[PDB]
Design an enzyme around this catalytic site. Sequence first.
Site, PDB file in Angstrom:
ATOM      1  N   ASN A   1       7.301   8.031   9.185  1.00  9.44           N
ATOM      2  CA  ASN A   1       6.170   8.945   9.058  1.00  9.44           C
ATOM      3  C   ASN A   1       6.169  10.080  10.078  1.00  9.44           C
ATOM      4  O   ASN A   1       5.626  11.150   9.783  1.00  9.44           O
ATOM      5  CB  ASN A   1       4.860   8.166   9.156  1.00  9.44           C
ATOM      6  CG  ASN A   1       4.409   7.626   7.818  1.00  9.44           C
ATOM      7  OD1 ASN A   1       4.866   8.079   6.769  1.00  9.44           O
ATOM      8  ND2 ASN A   1       3.503   6.657   7.844  1.00  9.44           N
TER       9      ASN A   1
ATOM     10  N   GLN B   1       0.824  -1.204   0.000  1.00  7.70           N
ATOM     11  CA  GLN B   1       0.000   0.000   0.000  1.00  7.70           C
ATOM     12  C   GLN B   1       0.859   1.256   0.000  1.00  7.70           C
ATOM     13  O   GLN B   1       0.621   2.188  -0.782  1.00  7.70           O
ATOM     14  CB  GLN B   1      -0.932  -0.008   1.210  1.00  7.70           C
ATOM     15  CG  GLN B   1      -2.165   0.852   1.044  1.00  7.70           C
ATOM     16  CD  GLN B   1      -3.134   0.703   2.194  1.00  7.70           C
ATOM     17  OE1 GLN B   1      -3.982   1.565   2.421  1.00  7.70           O
ATOM     18  NE2 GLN B   1      -3.013  -0.394   2.931  1.00  7.70           N
TER      19      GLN B   1
ATOM     20  N   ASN C   1       3.238  11.386   0.835  1.00  6.48           N
ATOM     21  CA  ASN C   1       3.662  10.848  -0.449  1.00  6.48           C
ATOM     22  C   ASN C   1       4.117  11.949  -1.394  1.00  6.48           C
ATOM     23  O   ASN C   1       5.020  11.727  -2.202  1.00  6.48           O
ATOM     24  CB  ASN C   1       2.527  10.041  -1.077  1.00  6.48           C
ATOM     25  CG  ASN C   1       2.114   8.861  -0.225  1.00  6.48           C
ATOM     26  OD1 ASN C   1       2.921   8.299   0.513  1.00  6.48           O
ATOM     27  ND2 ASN C   1       0.845   8.483  -0.317  1.00  6.48           N
TER      28      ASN C   1
ATOM     29  N   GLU D   1      -3.152  -7.308  -2.686  1.00  8.55           N
ATOM     30  CA  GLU D   1      -4.574  -7.066  -2.514  1.00  8.55           C
ATOM     31  C   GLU D   1      -5.035  -6.011  -3.508  1.00  8.55           C
ATOM     32  O   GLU D   1      -4.254  -5.141  -3.904  1.00  8.55           O
ATOM     33  CB  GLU D   1      -4.887  -6.631  -1.073  1.00  8.55           C
ATOM     34  CG  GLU D   1      -4.212  -5.347  -0.626  1.00  8.55           C
ATOM     35  CD  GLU D   1      -5.037  -4.128  -0.961  1.00  8.55           C
ATOM     36  OE1 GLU D   1      -6.250  -4.298  -1.190  1.00  8.55           O
ATOM     37  OE2 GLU D   1      -4.481  -3.010  -0.989  1.00  8.55           O
TER      38      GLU D   1
ATOM     39  N   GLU E   1      27.212   6.817  -9.011  1.00 11.02           N
ATOM     40  CA  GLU E   1      28.004   7.976  -8.616  1.00 11.02           C
ATOM     41  C   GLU E   1      27.756   8.346  -7.161  1.00 11.02           C
ATOM     42  O   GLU E   1      28.703   8.583  -6.406  1.00 11.02           O
ATOM     43  CB  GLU E   1      27.704   9.162  -9.531  1.00 11.02           C
ATOM     44  CG  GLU E   1      28.300   9.043 -10.923  1.00 11.02           C
ATOM     45  CD  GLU E   1      29.625   9.767 -11.052  1.00 11.02           C
ATOM     46  OE1 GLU E   1      29.821  10.780 -10.349  1.00 11.02           O
ATOM     47  OE2 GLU E   1      30.472   9.323 -11.856  1.00 11.02           O
TER      48      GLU E   1
ATOM     49  N   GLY F   1       2.989  -6.174   5.528  1.00 10.63           N
ATOM     50  CA  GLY F   1       3.147  -7.563   5.148  1.00 10.63           C
ATOM     51  C   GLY F   1       3.688  -7.722   3.745  1.00 10.63           C
ATOM     52  O   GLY F   1       4.696  -8.405   3.532  1.00 10.63           O
ATOM     53  N   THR F   2       3.017  -7.094   2.777  1.00 11.52           N
ATOM     54  CA  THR F   2       3.460  -7.187   1.390  1.00 11.52           C
ATOM     55  C   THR F   2       4.844  -6.579   1.218  1.00 11.52           C
ATOM     56  O   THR F   2       5.772  -7.249   0.753  1.00 11.52           O
ATOM     57  CB  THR F   2       2.455  -6.494   0.471  1.00 11.52           C
ATOM     58  OG1 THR F   2       1.156  -7.068   0.656  1.00 11.52           O
ATOM     59  CG2 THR F   2       2.874  -6.637  -0.983  1.00 11.52           C
TER      60      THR F   2
ATOM     61  N   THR G   1       1.725   2.221  13.234  1.00 13.88           N
ATOM     62  CA  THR G   1       0.373   1.792  12.908  1.00 13.88           C
ATOM     63  C   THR G   1       0.131   0.306  13.133  1.00 13.88           C
ATOM     64  O   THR G   1      -1.029  -0.116  13.166  1.00 13.88           O
ATOM     65  CB  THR G   1       0.053   2.127  11.448  1.00 13.88           C
ATOM     66  OG1 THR G   1       0.612   1.121  10.597  1.00 13.88           O
ATOM     67  CG2 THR G   1       0.641   3.479  11.073  1.00 13.88           C
TER      68      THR G   1
END
Lengths: 429, 430, 57, 439, 166, 44
Positions: free
Chosen positions: D206, D11, D228, D71, D254, D144-145, D179
């Site tokens: 974060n 995500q 983001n 997902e 470099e 997880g992913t 989180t």
Amino acid sequence: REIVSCQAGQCGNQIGSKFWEVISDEHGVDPTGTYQGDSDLQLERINVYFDESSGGRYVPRAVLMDLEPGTMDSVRAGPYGQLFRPDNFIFGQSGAGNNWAKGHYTEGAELIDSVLDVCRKEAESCDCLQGFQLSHSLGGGTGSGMGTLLISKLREEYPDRIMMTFSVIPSPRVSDTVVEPYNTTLSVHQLVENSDESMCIDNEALYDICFRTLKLTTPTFGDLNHLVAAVMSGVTCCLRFPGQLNSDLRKLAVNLVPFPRLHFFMMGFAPLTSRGSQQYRGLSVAELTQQMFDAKNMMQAADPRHGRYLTASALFRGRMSTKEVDEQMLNVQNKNSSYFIEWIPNNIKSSICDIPPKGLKMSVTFIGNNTCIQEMFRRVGEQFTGMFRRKAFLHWYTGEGMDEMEFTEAESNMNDLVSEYQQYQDATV
Amino acid sequence: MREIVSCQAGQCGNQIGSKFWEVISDEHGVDPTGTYQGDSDLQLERINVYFDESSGGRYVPRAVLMDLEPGTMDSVRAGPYGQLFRPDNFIFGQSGAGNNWAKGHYTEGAELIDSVLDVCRKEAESCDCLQGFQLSHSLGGGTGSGMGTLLISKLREEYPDRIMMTFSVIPSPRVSDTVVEPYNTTLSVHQLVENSDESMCIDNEALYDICFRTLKLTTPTFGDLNHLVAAVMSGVTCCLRFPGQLNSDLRKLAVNLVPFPRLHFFMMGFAPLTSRGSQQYRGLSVAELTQQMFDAKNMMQAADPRHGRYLTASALFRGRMSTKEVDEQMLNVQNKNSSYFIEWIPNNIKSSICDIPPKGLKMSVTFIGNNTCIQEMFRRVGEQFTGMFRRKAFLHWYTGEGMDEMEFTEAESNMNDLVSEYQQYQDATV
Amino acid sequence: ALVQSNRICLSPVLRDFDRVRKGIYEHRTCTRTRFARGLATQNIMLPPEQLQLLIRK
Amino acid sequence: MREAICIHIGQAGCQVGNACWELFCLEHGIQPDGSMPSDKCIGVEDDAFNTFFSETGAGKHVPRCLFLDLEPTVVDEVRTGTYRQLFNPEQLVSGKEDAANNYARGHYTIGKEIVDLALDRIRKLADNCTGLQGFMVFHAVGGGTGSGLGALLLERLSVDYGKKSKLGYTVYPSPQVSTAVVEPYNCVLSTHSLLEHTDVATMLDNEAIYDLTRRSLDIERPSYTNVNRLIGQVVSSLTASLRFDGALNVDLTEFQTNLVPYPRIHFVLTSYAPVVSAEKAYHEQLSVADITNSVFEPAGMLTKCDPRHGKYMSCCLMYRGDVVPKDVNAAIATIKTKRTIQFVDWCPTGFKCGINYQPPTVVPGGDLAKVQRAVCMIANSTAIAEVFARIDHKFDLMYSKRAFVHWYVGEGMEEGEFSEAREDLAALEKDYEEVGAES
Amino acid sequence: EEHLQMRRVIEVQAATRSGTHASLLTPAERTKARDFYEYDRNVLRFYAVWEKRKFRILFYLADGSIAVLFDKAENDGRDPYPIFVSRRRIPKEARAVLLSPETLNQPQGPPPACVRAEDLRTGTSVDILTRPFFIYDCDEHTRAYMEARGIPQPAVAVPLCEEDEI
Amino acid sequence: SLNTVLHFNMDKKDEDTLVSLLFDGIEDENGDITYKQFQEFVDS
Ligand SMILES: Nc1nc2c(ncn2[C@@H]2O[C@H](COP(=O)(O)OP(=O)(O)OP(=O)(O)O)[C@@H](O)[C@H]2O)c(=O)[nH]1
Ligand SMILES: Nc1nc2c(ncn2[C@@H]2O[C@H](COP(=O)(O)OP(=O)(O)O)[C@@H](O)[C@H]2O)c(=O)[nH]1
Ligand SMILES: Nc1nc2c(ncn2[C@@H]2O[C@H](COP(=O)(O)OP(=O)(O)O)[C@@H](O)[C@H]2O)c(=O)[nH]1
């Protein structure tokens, strides 16, 4: 004086079409056959390659040959296809089938009669022939089979006349067939005995020319045929135009063939710069000499540095001097004596033609009897032996009428010629 | 007649040569498109020194451009005189050196240097009687130093009797913009020592100081920063391209400024260098030219010249000036600064005169100095090299590219013995 | 329509932009940059011409 | 020529990629339809987009990015979003089931059935490319992913692509605001690939972004979209050196060999400035020295690691805009003069600067105010030991009681590799201490 | 002018002494600041030809710079690198690009004239580094911009190029 | 020079033809030609 040409197969026909376009451009002949050249020297010796009819139309002394009638229509409908005589298009209903057996023994046999008939007609039209020319590819069926049949018949009929062949030799990087080892093996052994001089062209080197020198992003077979047609025209430049040091096909053959079986030459042509590079390249005869001996410049896919030069020929075009023509050959011989042969000092002959190619100032075509041709020959022999060990693909030839002993004789000739080249490469005084 | 073929290596070398050729084109009246537009026969008299004529009435520089990144190649080709170079002389790799000396000298530079030498040999053969190879590079980079040194070594092997002039931009701690300047410089200095007839050092710190104080420029980019080194490079070969009262070639400079083979590292200077507001207020004369030339702060590499002693010096004056006013000035500087020179080498200064100053100048001078103060810069970067080498930081990158650990120690030992030579000849007495 | 489709609530972000950096509890007015801030934080991509028209009105 | 392949995982990776790709599209003047305006010219170099977009004979520009999530929510959001026509229908892989904050699930159960086609898409992209500089993998190791599938994918890339450069932009768990509860497990298990198969690892936790946007962007309530956007601005600043021309252009290798001293030492601090809003920008004299000072201040960091608590090892500053070459020299000089930060004794230079003439762009209604110049510092330093110790103690407090261990164990991963991760972090801490120790 | 330069140079000296930066700006960077804030990412595109080669001339309003980019043809034979002249302010006189070795700045008098939007017109040949680029067409944005400025930009027939001959 | 260096020494008509072959349409008001035009004539 006059030279009569023949085209075999799709490759040979397209190469010959481009060659005839080049010759017509040089001699100022439109596709309609009429003459608009602004120079007198073109009409002075236009008769070597063209025969004029009663009405003044110039028709090429060309005989076209292909079992498949496909490329005949293409070459006829091409921009310069109207030039050729309509009855000089001899073709069969059935295609060559990419088989030397039925291109040389069954299908080509029944049509080689008419081929020799039209060749005889052209020869009789000529006063007496300077020689025969044959453009073909050894990897095909009709370019190889009936082309070699024509070479054999013309060998038997015209013994003292020259036969020069432009043979396209396949390479593994370019190979678009699986039986070209068989076809080349069965063809070049005939070429050894029946050809006065043979000249090998490899599509790998032809493509590399556009890879590096011309840097063409999408170069086509038209561009490759133009590259070989520059040579095709430049070989007979001294015959068709005056010069300070004249030469002809027998001139080159005598100065380039020390022994009868070594007449396989590798070709080069070195006014070759890209459109971007020519803006900065300062054209001169010394630079022409520098480019004509470059390994990557040659249009035959074998590195000349790996062998030794028996003989070389430099057909310079363009009204230039003679010191830098010959003393430059002296320089390259002296500075690369290792690359040349000690028992034949002064391996390089030069010839000068006054008329330069259209749009250029000076040019040169390079003939080389180097001992790196046996590299191509031994690799194709290895491929042939690998094919022949398990008798694969042989049943087509046997069904068409070929027998195993002829393949064995072909490979024996291969080994003999490779050894013949090697024992002069390693020979010492 | 006598030809100097140039080799730009790395981003810094390419940028320097890009406008070095611009200055040379100005001096020879070469139009940006390439055509010759000069109005005097002196421009065309010796245009073959740096250019090879083409078939369109134009001239192409005898320049071989080298880098492992196409970006700087496009940047140099996009300049106003970028179209001047031959396209085949642009030799580049797809993967950059990554600012790694090992990668630029052993893996990618090794593979590309074959084509580099092919083009260099073609240029040399085009030159009827080649006299020298000049190269422009930076020791702080990866491809400018690593691949440049390999080119220098094999060019020395191919042409033992020719002059391997090198212009090396030496990094400084206050200007350092990399963490492996010490590694690259140490790995390159021994190659320069063993394969260069004369190496000439440039410091960005000294260039910035010169721009700040003498030129008094607010915020100009690398352009006029390289303008000084380009002008000096043009002025080094002045007598080759133009006649003068006392001609001098690169071999004459080398023999007059290299008393010992290991001592060929030279500090640079140019004169006069006047700010925009003070141009009309300065009377350009040979005396003031000598003062500015021997001024400590005017030197083009950032090392204090009054700490050491001058082994030899060379002045290349350009313009129409009288001769005793250029040699008696040198006598005067020897007399009033005898403590700044070396006693056992009398007549420390070469003086040469060229009748043609740079376009827009009444009279100028380029200064070359074999002072014994370059060892200060050498020790300054060698201390950093030792500091990194003791902890082996940033060394796995060099080891993984095929380079061994012993070569770093060999480079350090060679650099130390060079510093020892400089120090002992500084302190040597009659 | 987009608001009842996506359950859009620009009130809290606009309120925070009104009272951000500022000791003023509320002024009932906010800058165009902060209005675009609120729309972007609520993820409503709009053309610059449309945004200019909305802030002008 | 000079391409770079982006791989978004999870995500966090997918959303960071969305921000990065909208930024790249509006930097190169490419509409979300994937075309060129054809009526106006932005002025960007014609070959600039070759590093991120592949041409098509019809004029389309296909991003060289592979989205890979287990997902379908975020992938389908991309498929139905504003940039539906920009992205390839393939290289947008959505799985049938997520990893469920289980590094074991993302690496052993559902990662093995997806890494094959992921590698197929990667090799298709590489074949399309001609001068591929390297791979940039955007993910969060705390999920997880991004932990499991990320580790497996970087392992496979390292195996089948030799030593090509890799840039792992990873959103680590923050010291306090985190989180997930098994997020320490995911991070500690996924750091195996980061130590070995990651070529440069980039921290994007974060809390640092939240704190920076709290008082720099003049907005009380930013969110993941703003985070983001900041991350994408940093990515664009880093990649601009090879994207466009500049005074000192650098490439992945470099600032690789110039930033990584030891194979185990590649984690690097991140910061970006001048990060200002519309009100801030017009009132601040954002000179090169000022922006560099704001970069080196510890509040303007995008990683929650106090630089004063550690030893600075090597900092590379990517400048964009009208930065004259000696403004960076003056900034570095005043940095050395001021004693708040201190470098390690064996790295005297310790500084890199890469200048680009292309000024940073601002997305409409976006984070950054439209500024003439900016600079991003990527800094290897010993202060990362603090966050590593934080996450390791976080992991030990859970592993001592063997909490949540059965979720990892039951699918088919063993238990001793938890311990293996433990001494891997211990060795990382020890080598940080050793390199920070004075000679 | 020179007085302003003296003020700036001693301000830089004071900034070096005090470890700070120069607060106020030179008029040149002031003008570039308004130009960047008003006309960022606004570029005029002109299609021109020179020596039978197609070029795109990009005029940047933010700086007044001009960049020439080559457009290829299939099997043209040229190198595939588009940038012909990079982004910089191109003076009307070719020799003006290079500076005096004394000053390393512009000549003493007023700043030299540079190629401008008014200079760049369709149907005319603009001189860029002694290369006459015959501008034949421009995109819609540039056409509207020029028409608003008051000089019209009618599209004319493209001159002969290498693509026609190949 | 056509007689001093090039050793032509032909008649007046030939000399005029030789001069015209280089000095029609490529000469300025002073009758001078550039190295540009000279090499263009040479390589034509
Ligand atoms: N910087 C940043 N981090 C994000 C963003 N979205 C998610 N994350 C990170 O993702 C972490 C939580 O991971 P997950 O919620 O499990 O997402 P996932 O990795 O795809 O795992 P699943 O829940 O199985 O889909 C948080 O701690 C964040 O640090 C984002 O938009 N920006
Ligand atoms: N140089 C060149 N080679 C060609 C051309 N056409 C075909 N070839 C080569 O000829 C080979 C095939 O020969 P082919 O046409 O099948 O011979 P055929 O069956 O006797 O007509 C291929 O490997 C091609 O590379 C051409 O126009 N130019
Ligand atoms: N004078 C000058 N120095 C430069 C220029 N470009 C780079 N440098 C210096 O070179 C060093 C970096 O070298 P680099 O360009 O990376 O070398 P390369 O990687 O081998 O091309 C820096 O410390 C700069 O000071 C330039 O255009 N002019």
